[PDB]
Amino acid sequence: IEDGINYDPNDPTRVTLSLYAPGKSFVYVIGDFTNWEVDPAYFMYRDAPRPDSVHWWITIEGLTPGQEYAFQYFIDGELRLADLFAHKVLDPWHDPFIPSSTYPNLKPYPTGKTEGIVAVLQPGAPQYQWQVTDFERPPAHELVIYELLIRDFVARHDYVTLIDTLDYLERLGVNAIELMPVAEFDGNISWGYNPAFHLALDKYYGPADDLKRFVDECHRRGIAVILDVVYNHATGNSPLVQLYGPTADNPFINIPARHPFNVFYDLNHEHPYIQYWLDRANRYWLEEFRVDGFRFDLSKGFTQKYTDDDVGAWSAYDASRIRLLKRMADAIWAVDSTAYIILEHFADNQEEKELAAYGQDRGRAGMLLWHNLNRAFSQSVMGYLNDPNFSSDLTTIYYKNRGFPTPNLIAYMESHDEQWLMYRMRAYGARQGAYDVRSLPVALDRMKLAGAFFFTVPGPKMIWQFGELGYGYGERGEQCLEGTGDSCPSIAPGRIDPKPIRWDYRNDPLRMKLYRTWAELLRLRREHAVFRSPETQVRMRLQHGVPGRWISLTHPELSVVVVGNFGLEPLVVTPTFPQTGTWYDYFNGDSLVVDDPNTGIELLPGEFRLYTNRYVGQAE
Ligand SMILES: [Ca+2]
Ligand SMILES: [Mn+2]
């Protein structure tokens, strides 16, 4: 027996419920099976082996197999609380607005019988029949991740509709999908960073068995699924907050928050019960939905070290935080030794290096860290390479140039938290003569160039939905993210508000050429280890201000030179080819003789070329 809802694998008519609640006087279970009344047979037993480990529990008999029952703990005759470990809840304020098409036959809230969110249990639950048994998850350091917000990815915002997009995603050449938070969040309309029930599946995206079908279908196609998960904080609807109230008296929470950038109620990760709950949550998502790992939102917030509103102090090396993250990782890897642990961290290099290295000497992949190159890519594609404020240097895309010994950095040009590159190009892009980065077709070409200087570099990578079709700006600037230091037009939505959904972009041949370029780069990457391996040696000319940029890669199987003109006029770019001989132009289907490692390539602005030292086919 654990806290939460315990089923009997041999008897689908019964459950045992357990609640951690030191300091309480008495507890009842109320619910469908008590007609929401107080019934003595539902007064809970107190198990208190030591005063700091008080659990209330009861075994409930005589339930109907397959039936859903709503319930709450009724604590000290006042507090009605849904189970912290509920996997499904009914929300009286927001469930009325979930369409029947989104969640068929959704059990209605028991209006007037109780108040507040209720938990749902279901003895004899039908078990999804998993089809894929032999799934091999991509090596952590080879991840090419597609960040997806279900709300804005498809108009129907649900798992069953996601399944219809898988051909589109598979063909792009990504090997993992990262879903923005799926765990029960306040309301229906959210990015998902307002979690209420961290082990429940938000019903606005559809039923659990449809998510299972999605994970299984991804697995069938060799694609991993990562869940973005939000454990720094909990909303006031979380039982962590409600059980002892939203004050400093509540030992689970920090009032005030311990660090900058907190939202809702900052959790105390040093609390043993919070550690237990966190471990339970990670274990649940792995076991129940067979996901391949997690992206931990606001992982720098996993600390009791007090840094107030001082970002520099917060970001500095924090031994306690490192202990906590390692302890969490140990538990995850005891469930599944190759699950991905991805941190949205942004700490100082000493800390990030230590978390990256962790476990690599004793059976683990290390943690993966978000590596934000949105600004530098923004400057590069806009054509402001010697900007007075913002670096256009792309050198650190390669992990060793950031002083990391192993490919544990997930680089991205774009994320849900950052401006769209196409917004910045179309709103602000540079121009010279008749060459205008603000023109859509010109801007799309610059995203091909960006991709050639991104997907080709060893180490994991992430892209944000629809960048591959040139999402951003839109018709008149409405595709603009607020809060990124750009003054969006008035027509743009608020930062976390629903964004335009534009699947019609597939009908634009210019936008599909960008998609196909990225897809062809990722098709190459899939079968050529040069683009993926820690063994690859990388040299580059990606410095701030320099329009004629290049990357060389050398590996036992292949050598590659990528050339690009990030300027606004024609230029001869002179890479250092690693060897003389014939080099083959992948996209254009011809070849160049390199009689000196320093050979010039004339390029129009925005153009790139990818050369290999052996013929390996032609882009199709
Ligand atoms: Ca919700
Ligand atoms: Mn925190």
Side-chain angles (χ1 to χ4, degrees):
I1 300 307
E2 304 264 353
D3 294 324
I5 302 155
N6 303 256
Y7 299 110
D8 184 338
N10 291 316
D11 184 347
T13 72
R14 55 205 308 253
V15 295
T16 299
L17 303 180
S18 180
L19 165 70
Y20 179 76
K24 303 305 189 176
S25 169
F26 60 96
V27 187
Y28 271 99
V29 180
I30 59 172
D32 286 341
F33 44 71
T34 77
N35 193 49
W36 293 96
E37 300 176 77
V38 176
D39 170 349
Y42 291 89
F43 190 66
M44 294 184 94
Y45 296 107
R46 189 183 177 282
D47 190 60
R50 219 42 136 249
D52 67 356
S53 201
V54 178
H55 301 255
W56 307 85
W57 68 276
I58 194 172
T59 299
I60 294 165
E61 305 286 355
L63 298 175
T64 300
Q67 190 161 316
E68 289 187 300
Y69 295 89
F71 76 98
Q72 293 169 318
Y73 303 117
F74 185 45
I75 298 165
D76 290 349
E78 340 193 62
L79 171 60
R80 303 157 181 279
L81 192 87
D83 199 312
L84 179 65
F85 296 100
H87 302 312
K88 178 166 174 185
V89 301
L90 312 176
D91 181 324
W93 305 286
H94 299 281
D95 286 2
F97 303 100
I98 302 180
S100 44
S101 46
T102 299
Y103 205 113
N105 312 134
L106 179 59
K107 177 173 173 62
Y109 182 93
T111 303
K113 295 241 164 276
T114 189
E115 287 184 341
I117 294 161
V118 297
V120 180
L121 61 80
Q122 184 183 19
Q127 279 311 304
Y128 172 85
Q129 297 305 119
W130 292 93
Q131 298 301 111
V132 175
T133 50
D134 55 2
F135 181 59
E136 281 163 349
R137 72 179 61 122
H141 75 279
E142 288 189 350
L143 278 166
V144 177
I145 299 162
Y146 192 93
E147 188 188 33
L148 194 162
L149 172 59
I150 295 169
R151 192 195 63 197
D152 296 354
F153 186 64
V154 290
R156 289 177 178 289
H157 57 78
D158 64 8
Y159 298 115
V160 62
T161 307
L162 288 191
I163 281 152
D164 295 344
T165 69
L166 280 185
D167 284 349
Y168 170 94
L169 293 176
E170 183 182 358
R171 175 43 202 159
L172 180 56
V174 299
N175 59 30
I177 307 315
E178 175 166 312
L179 302 176
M180 283 177 62
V182 299
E184 181 65 50
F185 47 71
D186 291 356
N188 293 317
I189 302 296
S190 190
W191 273 0
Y193 301 107
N194 55 342
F197 289 82
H198 291 73
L199 298 86
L201 189 66
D202 198 282
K203 305 187 302 305
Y204 188 70
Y205 296 155
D209 284 337
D210 290 352
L211 169 57
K212 289 184 183 185
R213 193 184 164 237
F214 175 77
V215 169
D216 210 18
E217 281 307 325
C218 290
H219 286 174
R220 188 190 299 204
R221 299 166 183 250
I223 299 178
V225 177
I226 296 159
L227 300 187
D228 188 343
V229 291
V230 187
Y231 298 108
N232 172 77
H233 53 263
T235 74
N237 284 346
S238 167
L240 294 174
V241 177
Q242 290 172 324
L243 178 66
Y244 296 114
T247 75
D249 286 347
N250 179 336
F252 295 154
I253 72 182
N254 303 132
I255 306 290
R258 309 299 292 186
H259 54 71
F261 280 96
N262 183 63
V263 287
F264 304 104
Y265 294 96
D266 190 39
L267 298 181
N268 182 346
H269 276 280
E270 290 282 1
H271 195 295
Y273 197 68
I274 294 293
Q275 287 172 17
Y276 172 77
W277 163 82
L278 175 60
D279 294 348
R280 283 288 301 288
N282 288 330
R283 178 161 66 80
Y284 168 75
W285 292 106
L286 287 169
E287 288 181 343
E288 186 66 18
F289 291 94
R290 300 202 181 178
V291 295
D292 298 290
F294 301 109
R295 168 268 193 198
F296 289 92
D297 184 64
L298 203 44
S299 53
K300 253 190 330 200
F302 293 37
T303 187
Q304 289 306 103
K305 178 181 173 186
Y306 183 82
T307 59
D308 160 80
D309 271 8
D310 185 343
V311 173
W314 181 39
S315 298
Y317 185 95
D318 177 349
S320 73
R321 176 163 66 215
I322 296 166
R323 187 194 75 83
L324 288 174
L325 285 172
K326 284 173 181 181
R327 185 213 73 69
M328 178 188 77
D330 298 336
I332 289 169
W333 285 328
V335 174
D336 181 333
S337 64
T338 67
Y340 308 131
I341 305 183
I342 298 166
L343 304 183
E344 184 220 12
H345 208 49
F346 311 124
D348 79 11
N349 214 42
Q350 176 190 3
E351 172 157 345
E352 292 207 339
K353 283 166 41 59
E354 186 169 342
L355 295 162
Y358 187 59
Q360 285 203 55
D361 61 352
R362 65 198 74 187
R364 319 296 187 226
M367 302 185 218
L368 300 183
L369 296 296
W370 275 24
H371 183 199
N372 186 349
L373 288 172
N374 172 261
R375 192 79 259 175
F377 273 101
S378 287
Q379 298 312 125
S380 298
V381 298
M382 281 189 285
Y384 298 117
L385 310 182
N386 193 29
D387 189 85
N389 288 280
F390 294 139
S391 178
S392 63
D393 200 307
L394 299 176
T395 300
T396 66
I397 192 156
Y398 180 58
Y399 60 95
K400 294 187 176 176
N401 296 160
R402 230 193 87 189
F404 285 61
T406 65
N408 281 245
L409 296 171
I410 304 166
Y412 55 91
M413 307 181 287
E414 292 186 326
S415 83
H416 80 268
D417 274 317
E418 306 303 334
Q419 189 62 272
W420 287 286
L421 291 193
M422 185 59 63
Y423 175 79
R424 286 181 178 161
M425 287 187 287
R426 298 219 56 220
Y428 313 126
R431 42 268 282 283
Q432 186 179 310
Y435 180 76
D436 189 358
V437 170
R438 303 188 194 159
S439 178
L440 178 63
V442 171
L444 287 167
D445 280 345
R446 292 188 68 104
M447 291 302 294
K448 302 171 190 165
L449 171 62
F453 282 73
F454 178 74
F455 298 112
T456 53
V457 178
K461 298 296 176 284
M462 181 182 71
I463 63 177
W464 168 224
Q465 67 188 28
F466 301 115
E468 69 280 358
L469 298 175
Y471 194 97
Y473 196 83
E475 302 309 317
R476 59 186 293 176
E478 67 287 352
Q479 300 167 9
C480 188
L481 187 65
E482 287 211 316
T484 79
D486 301 322
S487 292
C488 290
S490 299
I491 185 173
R495 181 179 173 83
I496 73 169
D497 290 347
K499 308 299 189 303
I501 309 179
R502 298 298 303 267
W503 283 104
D504 59 300
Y505 281 176
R506 289 178 300 168
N507 300 329
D508 187 339
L510 295 177
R511 297 180 179 273
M512 284 307 298
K513 283 159 52 217
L514 170 59
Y515 173 103
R516 286 195 277 261
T517 302
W518 287 8
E520 285 299 296
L521 292 168
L522 286 175
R523 185 160 75 101
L524 265 171
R525 178 173 177 127
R526 180 191 325 122
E527 288 276 6
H528 292 281
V530 62
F531 299 109
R532 306 195 312 266
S533 179
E535 189 170 1
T536 299
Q537 177 178 83
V538 173
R539 304 179 69 248
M540 43 173 70
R541 176 144 184 74
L542 300 184
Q543 293 90 351
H544 184 73
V546 171
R549 293 185 171 180
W550 61 264
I551 303 165
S552 71
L553 308 174
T554 60
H555 175 281
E557 66 100 11
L558 198 63
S559 293
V560 183
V561 170
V562 186
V563 202
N565 180 357
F566 284 81
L568 308 177
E569 60 180 23
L571 178 65
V572 176
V573 183
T574 310
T576 305
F577 284 86
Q579 200 46 94
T580 56
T582 303
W583 289 73
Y584 298 86
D585 180 328
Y586 189 71
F587 286 82
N588 297 303
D590 57 5
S591 58
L592 169 72
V593 168
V594 175
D595 284 344
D596 190 302
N598 297 307
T599 291
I601 312 292
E602 188 173 322
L603 291 176
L604 286 178
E607 298 248 8
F608 78 93
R609 304 285 186 267
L610 191 160
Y611 295 101
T612 62
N613 69 335
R614 319 178 281 105
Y615 188 70
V616 294
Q618 180 183 333
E620 75 187 21

